[PDB]
């Protein structure tokens, strides 16, 4: 104690703080310790400690295989109250620890437009799951992990080594059936000790495997969580801080016109964390790359995740970039002061090159200043204060590109319009996220823009939704604008709108409709073919643009499930999963006949796990079940019976006392049919279809 070298203190501090976290879950926080230790080791030892705690429970449930342990720990973490995990949530939510976790691939910020909106409880659960997977893999390969016994200088150490031995038996329960340990003394773990040498026979370099069995690593500590001494030694030591710092340091169906449905189109978006509007941007680049917009600043109104901002910046770089999106500090996680930062732009190439100081393509380092002083009304463009502040900071006649993507005149749209009119450099470009379906609004917008813009081009993105009549306006600020003011343009636009025909010629409307019907049909056939055939490589240039922009397939971190090479093994996996995790459900159901809420949450967790199993292994499904899963998801629900049938569940799962009695089988079939079907929100549907696209693209 206290005599180990400095190189050994940091992993020991990580082990001790991980033990503290695990005891906490099974204002208090651990940022002080985690900022001065190995955060990846912290989560690895957290997984190790949680595995030690759950070893006996998983052994008495006859869990087999690494994935069985992973599913059990996932549901255990998902079933704890959110107040209990707030200790780990607070540590992860800290900006330094958050960036550390992101950079060590432990944490990926997904499904949140802003960092402050991230589900840090789910984020902590994901980190602990990653640590558990790392521990299981390292144990399987033979990397033994030290067990610490604080407050011991007995029998509890013999129990702890028994927990580790039972974990090891559980890992290889497929090859050989583990013996019973129920109702047995902590000393009689020698039976398990003996059978692990038998299991070791059935595979390479066994020396490390056997060493962790016969000679378990153990380290008893007379003091108790000891961690404070290690933390003080690390902080005081100069090298220690030096060591910590060193450790942590093609779709061409788009067309241009120069002047309540399932989100199936997201499958064609197989890249990107959170929003993926760069896909709608790709078609814009094909027309705006010819002209010059790099000079001058760029302004992005309501950009949100900043995906379009990133992909515009990589190929069209600006000197100053003024992000702007709606955000209030009220939705921050406790004890955090997160600014509105686009969680997709921060991990992209432009911000990664800004932070490390490398120059951009133009040779001028991009200066990224979000428009945020602390007022929620300031982020909301409908307020006049927002307009005045935005115009103040960017400066009138300072920028050349303005990207307005405000979703569907409303006060915010006209406010965004005269922000641009005031701030664009003469000859500057505006890209606008219009909408053709309310044609009156379209005529109004076209007239007001035409008063002071020239070369107004209407472009429908080939990657946009085929049902929303979306149009991306491509217009240039007219040189030498002699327009009196914005209000005259607006009032006069009202006149034309209420006194005469719309400025759009009927021939252009007919052309738009004629190209729109064929484009929608073609895109729908492309989506249908991609979902059905599941060809791995389709439209490589578009996704290559995303990869150059800094986008990566986010299915790796959201879908950590394995990729079975056979469909029979897939079905067998849920045959184990359902039969293992419905035991509690049946137990409480028989006990009561409060509990119904637990029943429902366990059922929902099981069905969601089955859903992600299906999505991860979507490619290897036969086309018939692929088709029926697509049909089920289209109405917005995930029926469990399509993937696997109750007779298959009974056949492909080990025989047990559960699922053995006529009443038990009857209630299993009752809970097995439509009564366990779950519903999916629209954002959930986009998540699922994007994940399917990612799986197809990567497999």
Numbering used by the authors: 1434 to 1459, 1478 to 1604, 1609 to 1657, 1663 to 1685, 1688 to 1711, 1736 to 1745, 1772 to 1920, 1929 to 2113, ...
Task: Copy out sentences from the published article reporting this entry, exactly as the authors wrote them.
L and P function as the RNA polymerase complex, responsible for replicating and transcribing the viral genome. To catalyze the RNA synthesis in both replication and transcription, L sequentially consists of five domains: the RNA-dependent RNA polymerase domain (RdRp), polyribonucleotidyl transferase domain (PRNTase), connector domain (CD), methyltransferase domain (MTase), and C-terminal domain (CTD). P harbors an oligomerization domain (POD) for self-oligomerization, and the oligomeric P attaches to RdRp of L, tethering the polymerase to NC to extract the RNA strand for both replication and transcription. Here, we resolved two L–P complex conformations from the mumps virus (MuV), a typical member of nsNSVs, via cryogenic-electron microscopy.
RdRp-PRNTase is quite conserved in structure amongst nsNSVs, while CD-MTase-CTD resembles an appendage of RdRp-PRNTase with great structural diversity. In MuV Lintegral–P, the appendage is also less resolved compared with the body. Different from the conserved RdRp-PRNTase, CD-MTase-CTD of MuV Lintegral–P adopts a spatial organization distinct from those of PIV-5, though their individual structures are pretty similar. The detailed alignment showed that MTase and CTD in MuV Lintegral–P appears as an integral on the PRNTase side instead of the RdRp side compared with PIV-5 L. The overall spatial organization of CD-MTase-CTD in MuV Lintegral–P is surprisingly similar to VSIV L. VSIV CD-MTase-CTD is highly flexible unless unphosphorylated P locks their configuration, while in MuV, no P fragment is resolved around the appendage. In MuV Lintegral–P, an α-helix hinge termed Hinge-1 (L1416–1431) connecting PRNTase and CD has been visualized. It is supposed to provide flexibility to CD positioning via loops flanking it. Compared with PIV-5, the spatial organization of MuV CD-MTase-CTD renders the helices α53 (L1439–1458) and α57 (L1535–1544) of CD rotating upward and leaves more space for RNA to access MTase. Actually, MuV Lintegral–P forms a continuous positively-charged tunnel from the GDN to the K-D-K-E motifs, ideal for the RNA synthesis followed by 5’ capping and methylation, which is favorable as the transcription state.
